[PDB]
Amino acid sequence: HKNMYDHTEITTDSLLALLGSEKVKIIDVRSADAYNGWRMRGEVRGGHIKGAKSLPAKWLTDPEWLNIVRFKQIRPEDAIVLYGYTPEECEQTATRFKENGYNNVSVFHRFHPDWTGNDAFPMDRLEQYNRLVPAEWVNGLISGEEIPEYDNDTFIVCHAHYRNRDAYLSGHIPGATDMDTLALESPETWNRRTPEELKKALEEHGITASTTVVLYGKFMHPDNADEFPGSAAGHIGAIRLAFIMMYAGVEDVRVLNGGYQSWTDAGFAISKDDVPKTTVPEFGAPIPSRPEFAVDIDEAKEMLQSEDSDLVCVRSYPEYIGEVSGYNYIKKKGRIPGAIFAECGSDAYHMENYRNHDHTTREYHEIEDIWAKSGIIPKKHLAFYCGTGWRGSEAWFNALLMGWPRVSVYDGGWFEWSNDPENPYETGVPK
Ligand SMILES: C[N+](C)(C)[C@@H](Cc1cnc[nH]1)C(=O)O
Ligand SMILES: [Cl-]
Ligand SMILES: [Cl-]
Ligand SMILES: [Cl-]
Ligand SMILES: [Cl-]
Ligand SMILES: [Cl-]
Ligand SMILES: [Cl-]
Ligand SMILES: [Cl-]
Ligand SMILES: [Cl-]
Ligand SMILES: [Mg+2]
Ligand code: NI
Incomplete structure (x- = not known):
């Protein structure tokens, strides 16, 4: 019955x-x-x-x-x-x-x-769940309320975007200031900037090493027909900046789970004020404090030959087989030989396989089980990578949240790898 x-x-x-x-x-x-x-x-x-x-x-x-x-x-x-x-x-x-x-x-x-x-x-x-905060926690933080998993007295809420202040000005968390992804990454290499640049950028945005940074971005439906689809993948850029800040040495970095969508789904008030930045004079720590988080091309090549290490390709399948480059500013198409494939999703500006429909991180057990099916396991030193390091950062952040002890981002990605014509590359459906 x-x-x-x-x-x-x-x-x-x-x-x-x-x-x-x-x-x-x-x-x-x-x-x-x-x-x-x-x-x-x-x-x-x-x-x-x-x-x-x-x-x-x-x-x-x-x-x-x-x-x-x-x-x-x-x-x-x-x-x-x-x-x-x-x-x-x-x-x-x-x-x-x-x-x-x-x-x-x-x-x-x-x-x-x-x-x-x-x-x-x-x-x-989730072992390190306190780095992936709910909207209710951020609302308590900016309201001066008593919240768990917080023992600081200095914080900043940072709205991330790629050369698109309209993503911030059209609606943001009250009190938050905006950070362009170009503040911490260089347009020449699409890698993290030098330590001296990072120090100045963080100070000018009001961030010290002992400042609790809460990062989020706004999803605005990236369209490959636009010149800069990355300007709409705001929350990937938030996680990209979280990686760079943790690499630089900000001790306490949080990411709002699901980004702006979670803030509005919770029904909290939103602001459209262009909040002026309150600079600080001294970051207060050597940059980078966590250099192990970032892997460059020479170390990446060594990881491809080490029994202890692996590169993880977080790109889409069309990029993997060389159908497309994924970007309107990359002409070379192909894949790095010897990397383990962990498909990101539909294209370069979406992370469907690592996210729920509401942009929160996918149930971590599902990610861990898929990864283990390909030999992506915590006992190895893993360097996640993609086109320019955005998608690799979000995959890296997921492994970080599980408490994996040796996870990094290979910053250069396919952009740097394919820019040297002497670097080998594969193409076509793997055989
Ligand atoms: C490094 N930029 C910001 C130019 C990239 C970032 C990126 C997004 N999805 C993959 N990479 C872009 O927007 O193409
Ligand atoms: Cl925790
Ligand atoms: Cl809470
Ligand atoms: Cl655009
Ligand atoms: Cl846009
Ligand atoms: Cl996004
Ligand atoms: Cl690749
Ligand atoms: Cl069960
Ligand atoms: Cl780690
Ligand atoms: Mg890069
Ligand atoms: Ni290997």
Whole structure:
């Protein structure tokens, strides 16, 4: 007897006995930030039930909801167990599953505070989740409110963009200032600038080594027909700048999960003031403080020959096989020989395979499992790269969030590699 609106409750004892069953899918309908580890209700242990998948209830309004569920390999023959902070949060999702051919759907009522409140119930979390902050956390930061995972007294919220101040002026987080990606990267090499330039740029934007920097960008639908599609991939540029700042030596860098979209989806107020910058005289630390984060072409070539290391190609498949260069300013087409392929998504200005539809980072278990299928594992020294280092930065940031101990970005990427005609390259569908 199937009931569309009254859902069977599964008990704690029943759920414990089902932990590790291959026919059970445990589904966490809270926000992705709570899933990652943020203790959004003040619970003592944050994260998700061990083995649970993430399906935020907010996605019920996505017309591709069923395609998401199927992409996550959640099948009708599976027993589905939903949980949230409350059982009431799961009722609409439970009904939606039943409306789409899923007949075995249950709701677990005792995740919080029963499961979160007992040491014997297993939970998982993203090891460095506090670097990927929710919109509620940023709102508390700028409001002077008491927030977890913050012990500083100096902060700056930074809106990233590529030569497009309209992305900032058309709507930004209150109090935030804008940072053009050209402030930290050079248009001649599309690599990070020299230490002396980075020191001046950071100071002029009001950033010291001991300043908590919160970075975000605005997605504005990049179109390859425009001259600068990167001006619309604002949140990749935010993560690009987060990489450069962490390389330079800013001790505490956070990224707003999902960028501007998360701020408006949370319903917070937005400002259009052109906030003047409050400069600081001294960055206060040698640049770079974390040089291991950045890999150049000589070290990258050594990594291609080392048993201990690997380059990770975070480009699209058309770029990989040499159909296109991916950019209107690169004529050479092909791939670096010996790199491990980890497809970014559709083109150079999208990161579909590393993101959800709302631009938050994809469930990290899925990324880790895909990576491990290709030999991309934390025991190696990995240098993520792409065209110019933007997409490689976002992949690098994801591995950083998992706590991987030796991950870097090969800054030069295909742009630098193909600019030397003596560098070997492959083309065509791999054989
Ligand atoms: C280095 N710029 C900003 C010129 C790149 C950045 C980039 C975006 N997606 C891949 N690379 C661009 O916009 O083509
Ligand atoms: Cl399971
Ligand atoms: Cl953390
Ligand atoms: Cl919070
Ligand atoms: Cl443009
Ligand atoms: Cl634009
Ligand atoms: Cl983006
Ligand atoms: Cl490549
Ligand atoms: Cl690392
Ligand atoms: Mg570069
Ligand atoms: Ni190798």
